Amino acid sequence: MRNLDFIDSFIPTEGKYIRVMDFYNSEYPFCIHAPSAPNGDIMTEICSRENNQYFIFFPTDDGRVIIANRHNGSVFTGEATSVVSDIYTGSPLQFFREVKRTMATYYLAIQNPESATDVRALEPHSHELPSRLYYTNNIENNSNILISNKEQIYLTLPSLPENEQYPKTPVLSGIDDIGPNQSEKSIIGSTLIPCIMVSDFISLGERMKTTPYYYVKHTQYWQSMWSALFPPGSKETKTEKSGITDTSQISMTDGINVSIGADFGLRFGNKTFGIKGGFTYDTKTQITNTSQLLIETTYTREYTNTENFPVRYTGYVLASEFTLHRSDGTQVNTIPWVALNDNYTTIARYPHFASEPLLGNTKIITD
């Protein structure tokens, strides 16, 4: 359609809107309120329209949610006997499960060093007065843990780019054509990432209001490594770079809490570990199966022209790049996050009917 095209949107998923919460059984208009300070006790306070009372539920791979307030971006953190507001560190006590008992009412549960065991729900000790949120094992047929949404404001998400087809190998126009330094960049995939998991100069509280979601864009392209006119039957030695620089790995890790493994799979830190499955699916990448990090390696390779005529040859290496963007589209990272993979190479040639160069011996330079 046009309208019906957004039929999926009419009934939104948990992390597409800002909400105001209240316990169903309270008769007086109490709302769940977060402290102005970055750390403090979560409380039921008289409902007002302040950002202390507005929350976004950020969903994770397994369906659990991270609950951040719109005033400062601090999240719900489970503690000994009470729920407090604190800075998101990816701690296990910062993941909650929303359970819908009915279409309109739900309760929030936290789980222990246990699995199927002690699921306890959040409950106030009063309906008449402002209260802290405590735990209870009394779940079944208990309406005191029951929460309702007073308000629901729909979020406008950034427009994500359309997925492109794998990058094609560059063509050469003549014997003197070295070819382009890079091929056209191809959008392989892009994914949405909560503002609380990214590094930026904008304050958390401000990100919550204007850019609650950031997005990571994944692109591929062919990078030029070398180019030469090979005389008939000549052997030449060309140098080919591979992997990721030390600065780029540090910048990426700092910026999105994601690193690249030696197998070219991705390594997720404590902040992003819970969303790794959604991240890799959207970007068409894989999770790493090794603990070694990808480093930078310089290789030498012998190439022999077997044709009886001179040939132009340009060597390209497959480049994979990640960019961090704000809701307004602006790019956050100033340092490039690029990994070159020397296992995937393509050799552009003139004339086109000429054979592939014969690959001889490969060495590694210890600069």
């Binding site: 309208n3 039929i7 999926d8 397994d62 959604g278």
Partner: protein, 421 residues
């Protein structure tokens, strides 16, 4: 918009697994001959190690990154038996898929990636046990898991018995993913006698699709060997269409009672459980049982249908609605609700089964004569006649106007009792 389910390479190929250090080409084998090593007894279930009769194994990816290892020829999986051998070791045995912890393995890559000389190991029980050949590198023996783990940087002699590389392979059978399409507008009747479009003739829109590993699928038509070789992954399609609830001529200025049956019946739910260990929750999200649970997240991500947030099962919904025709003429009215359709197909395209859930939350009406000739129909009374659960006991606040071709979203309308308070 095309689609990619994003399976890793090793989840798309049945590989022959050879030891990295063996000089005479020994690897994982289905050899009929028993173990030649004294302290390494073999039997009918033992996974063998030999340089003849190689096994071709696939690695199905679990949501937590662990793998299920299955054999191409007989469709059985690798299993860590609880029985003890010498030195507190467990034998690795062939068994039918159950989805238990003992069938899950963690792959860990190490070595010199820079020179392409890397290898991999299989671990169990939170990396406390490593899979190893029993005593030998170049002799027919068995496979077991040991709790005697050694350093990998200087590769101890014992570590060599745990190191694997990929060799030859067979392609798994992967069905092609269909392309998504848009949902059509609610179909208009062409005349007073036009009864509308029935579900059998309704135009479908593809919205999702997932690749289900054959081990979780119950397809009685095929034996486990044919199933694994020719139908390694089944295709599960997710579609939407406008499912007609009723079609009737309403006389001028008349109120009429109409029953609206939506949701899903128990028999259909039981069927989905039987075949896929999957079923629909009252919030229309997906629920899973033990045998398919390990793949929930990958499946739902592919389908574009969320994981359910309730434990309540969707059931049959029967509601009685009263409508009022305000026009001076007799009018053909027809009401459609959104159908959520799931289809299981084999690699060749053969349909195994269909399951439909009717979503009463998204529905609309169309008429003959159309607008602007006729005035829209009005809902004057809403009663819930029969429903086995109280997940959604809300009715519409009446009167409610149903504008031709407009979709009415139950959650965006005023209800009784009021929600979102």
């Amino acid at each position: 918009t095309s689609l990619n389910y994003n399976l890793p390479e090793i989840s798309k190929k049945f590989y022959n697994l050879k030891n990295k250090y063996s000089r005479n080409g020994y690897g994982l084998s289905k050899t009929e001959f028993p173990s030649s090593i004294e302290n390494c007894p073999s039997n009918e279930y033992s996974i063998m190690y030999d340089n003849k009769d190689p096994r071709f194994l696939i690695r199905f990816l679990l949501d937590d990154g662990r793998y299920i290892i299955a054999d191409r020829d007989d469709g059985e999986v690798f299993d860590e038996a609880p029985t003890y051998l010498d030195n507190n070791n467990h034998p690795i045995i062939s068994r039918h898929y159950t989805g238990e912890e003992r069938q899950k393995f963690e792959q860990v890559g190490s070595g010199d990636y820079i020179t392409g000389e890397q290898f991999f190991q299989f671990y169990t029980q939170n990396k406390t046990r490593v899979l190893s050949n029993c005593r030998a590198l170049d002799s027919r023996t068995i496979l077991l898991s040991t709790a005697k783990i050694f350093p990998i940087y200087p590769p101890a002699s014992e570590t060599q018995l745990t190191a694997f590389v990929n060799s030859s392979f067979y392609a798994a059978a992967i069905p092609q993913l269909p392309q998504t399409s848009l949902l059509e507008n609610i179909p208009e009747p062409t005349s007073l006698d036009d009864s509308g479009v029935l579900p059998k003739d309704a135009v479908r829109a593809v919205k999702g699709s997932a690749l289900l590993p054959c081990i979780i699928v119950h397809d009685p038509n095929l034996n486990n060997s044919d199933k694994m070789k020719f139908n390694t992954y089944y295709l599960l399609e997710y579609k939407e269409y406008w499912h007609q609830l009723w079609s009737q001529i309403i006389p001028a200025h008349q109120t009429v009672k109409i029953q609206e049956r939506t949701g899903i019946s128990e028999v259909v739910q039981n069927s989905m459980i039987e075949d896929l260990n999957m079923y629909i929750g009252a919030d229309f999200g997906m629920l899973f049982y033990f045998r398919s649970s390990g793949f929930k997240e990958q499946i739902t991500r592919g389908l574009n249908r969320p994981l359910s947030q309730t434990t309540t099962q969707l059931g049959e919904r029967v509601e009685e609605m009263e409508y009022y025709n305000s026009n001076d003429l007799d009018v053909r009215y027809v009401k459609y609700a959104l159908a959520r359709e799931f289809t299981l197909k084999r690699v060749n395209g053969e349909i195994v089964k269909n399951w439909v859930a009717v979503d009463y939350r998204l529905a609309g009406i169309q008429s003959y004569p159309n607008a602007p000739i006729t005035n829209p129909l009005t809902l004057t009374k809403h009663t819930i006649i029969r429903c086995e659960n109280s997940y959604d006991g809300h009715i519409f606040k009446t009167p409610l106007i149903f504008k031709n071709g407009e979709v009415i979203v139950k959650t965006n309308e005023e209800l009784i009792p009021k929600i979102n308070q």
